Amino acid sequence: SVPASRYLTDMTLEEMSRDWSMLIPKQKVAGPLCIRMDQAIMDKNIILKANFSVIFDRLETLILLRAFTEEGAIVGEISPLPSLPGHTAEDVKNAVGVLIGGLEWNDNTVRVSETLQRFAW
Amino acid sequence: SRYLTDMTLEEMSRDWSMLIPKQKVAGPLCIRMDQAIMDKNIILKANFSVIFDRLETLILLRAFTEEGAIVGEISPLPSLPGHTAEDVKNAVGVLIGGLEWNDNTVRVSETLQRFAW
């Protein structure tokens, strides 16, 4: 009934719900988060977009981050594990760093949305 | 996330002091309690956000005697690192043990039992 957090959206509901699959699948449990990334993706400009709650000038709960090429295809993802254990902005930022490292090893150029760099980084 | 409030705004805002201070960092949370407090009945109350069926962010937890006096508290560290329901639950277990070692009777609010403890 009483709202504790505002909800930031980088992604439309279309983007949030869209199914996708990886040509060359890589996944990694990074703490309480799951990282997925398509290893086939090379030499693209990529943007990380996330829908999540903020409390007090920081990311409180990540609902979904997805990585998108300029043409709007999904090439990566960070989501909470299915059992939904707790996580912080630190966890999120560590998963983001792993995802960027992996993408840039395939010569992608990765940027983070403005929302995300303000509230997590 | 929705906002749960065991404590009133006056309770959240009140300053208090300990006769025999005890302070303890428990992960990303600060536990405080007055060691001179004994033979009371105490209730732990908290104001916090909930997302899904779980405590997401603790704003403040305080321990109250039956007369409404503050004898203990768990708050985020001042640099506000993140925490989860698990951190709250560990800190709660510590504060309860300290308070019971001091011959108090301790209970936890219904909303805390439901979402954390």
Q: Least CB-CB distance to A60: which of B56, B85, B86? A: B56
Residue A70: DSSP 8-state: T
B75 neighbors B91 (Cβ within 8 angstroms)? no
Q: What residue type is B7 in one-letter code? A: M
C-alpha pair distances (Å), A52 with each of A4, A99, B41, B81, B99:
13, 18, 40, 18, 37
CA distance A95 to A61: 14
The three-point CA angle B95-A58-A78 to 5° equals 100
Residues of A in contact with B80 (CB under 8 A): 56, 58
Answer yes or no: do A58 and B80 touch at CB < 8 A.
Answer: yes
CA distance A107 to B6: 52
H or E element, residue B41: strand B41-50
Q: What residue type is A66 in one-letter code? A: R
B40 neighbors B71 (Cβ within 8 angstroms)? yes
C-alpha pair distances (Å), A74 with each of A67, B27, B66:
5, 37, 56
A76 φ, ψ (degrees, to nearest 5): -165, 170
Q: Least CB-CB distance to B84: which of A1, A56, A88? A: A88
Nearest to B115 by CA among B41, B33, B57: B57
When computed from its CA atoms, the radius of gyration of chain B, rounded to whole angstroms, is: 13
Closest Cα in chain A, distance from residue B87 (Å) = 10
A10 neighbors A62 (Cβ within 8 angstroms)? no
Residues of B in contact with A95 (CB under 8 A): none
Which residues pair with residue B23 across a beta bridge?
B32
**This structure's resolution (angstroms)?**
2.2
The three-state secondary structure class of B40 is coil
Q: Which domains does chain A have, with CATH numbers?
A: 1-121 (3.30.420.330)
Closest Cα in chain B, distance from residue A58 (Å) = 9
B74 neighbors B94 (Cβ within 8 angstroms)? no
Q: Least CB-CB distance to A60: which of B1, B5, B52? A: B1
Closest Cα in chain A, distance from residue B1 (Å) = 5
In our burial notation (b when 16+ CB lie closer than 10 A, e otherwise), range A16-27 reads: eeeeeebeeeee
Residue A21: DSSP 8-state: -
In our burial notation (b when 16+ CB lie closer than 10 A, e otherwise), range B19-53 reads: eeeeeeebebbbbbbbbebeebebbbbbbbbbbee
CA distance B88 to A30: 22
Residue B79: DSSP 8-state: T
What is the residue whose two structure tokens read 């090439």? A75
B109 φ, ψ (degrees, to nearest 5): -55, 150
Q: Least CB-CB distance to A89: which of B2, B54, B82? A: B82
